[PDB]
Amino acid sequence: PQITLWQRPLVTIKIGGQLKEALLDTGADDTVLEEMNLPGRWKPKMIGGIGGFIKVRQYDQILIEICGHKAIGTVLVGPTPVNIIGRNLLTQIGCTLNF
Amino acid sequence: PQITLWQRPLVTIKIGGQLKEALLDTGADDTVLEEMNLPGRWKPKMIGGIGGFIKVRQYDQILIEICGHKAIGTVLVGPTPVNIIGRNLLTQIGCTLNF
Ligand SMILES: COc1cc(CN2C(=O)N(Cc3ccc(O)c(OC)c3)N(Cc3ccccc3)C[C@@H](O)[C@H]2Cc2ccccc2)ccc1O
């Protein structure tokens, strides 16, 4: 769909059998979700944002359905205030910026 | 123009006579730029990001040219690692997210 930016670009996602709302974030290279019950192995990683860095658990090959569209990619899970869908998954659902 | 998201969405901006590159960021409510010379009065403010909070100076009614489109709005200046154009100015240049 076309999303104007007068309010935050929030979308419903289904990940690990759970329903969540997440921000479509063109400034984010990675997808990072708040702490959740997600199965399997993960590697430690660190990401830096405004205000500093956070330690996240990195899961690969995770299925996410973002507004009905399936995608599989890396998901970082950790102490973010907001669920973020970043550019690694936005390219997969064919999302563009237009002006 | 239409911008796909395989690379960071960076654009040239002109602000206070100086030329800079900035990220088009739909996850950012506000525009925050690295420390720069900027004329005027300002109010201290704090913004929260992924690793925590930073103190910024808020400048109102600042002219910014973003890819040859002029906009006037609030600009926050402070210790961000990247120049961020957030939704307060993205709606002014008519930017939409599409998928
Ligand atoms: C509430 O408004 C604002 C919020 C921010 C902070 N914020 C961040 O901390 N991240 C960091 C980041 C997240 C995920 C990544 O995958 C990443 O990699 C580049 C960086 N970036 C900006 C950034 C990019 C590169 C380097 C440093 C910073 C994406 C933003 O939308 C936003 C995400 C966010 C929104 C709301 C709450 C928490 C985080 C900035 C400006 C604002 O006006």
DSSP string, B49-78: ETTEEEEEEEEEEEEEEETTEEEEEEEEES
Among A84, A85, A87, A89, the mutation site with the greatest number of ligand 1 atoms within 8 A of its Cβ is: A84
Domain boundaries, chain B: 1-99
Domain B1-99 - what CATH class? mainly beta
Beta carbons within 10 angstroms of residue A1's beta carbon = 8
Count how many Cα atoms sit within 13 Å of the Cα of residue B21 in the half-sphere of its side chain.
4
Picking from A33, A43, A36, A26, the residue whose alpha carbon sits closest to that of residue A88 is A26
The verdict on the CB of residue A25 being under 6 Å from ligand 1 is yes
Atom index in ligand 1 nearest the CA of residue A50 equals: 9
Other Cβ atoms less than 10 A from the Cβ of B8: the count is 16
Please, are residues B76 and B31 in contact by the beta-carbon 8 Å criterion?
A: yes
Method: X-ray
Contact criterion met (CB < 8 Å) for B32 and A25? no
- Tell me the resolution in Å: 1.8
Using a CB-CB cut-off of 8 Å, the residues of chain A touching B53 are 51
Give the distance from CA A20 to its chain's centroid.
Answer: 11
B27 ligand 1 Cβ < 6 A: yes
Given a contact cutoff of 8 angstroms between Cβ atoms, the answer to whether A87 and B25 are in contact is: no
Residues B24, B13 contacting (CB under 8 angstroms): no
Location of structure tokens 């936005």: A90
Instruction: Say which residues have a Cβ less than 8 Å from residue A68's Cβ, sequence separation at least 6.
Output: none
Establish how many alpha carbons lie within 13 A of residue B13's alpha carbon, considering only the half-sphere containing its beta carbon.
27
Q: How far is residue B55's CA from residue B53's CA, in Å, rounded to a whole number?
A: 7
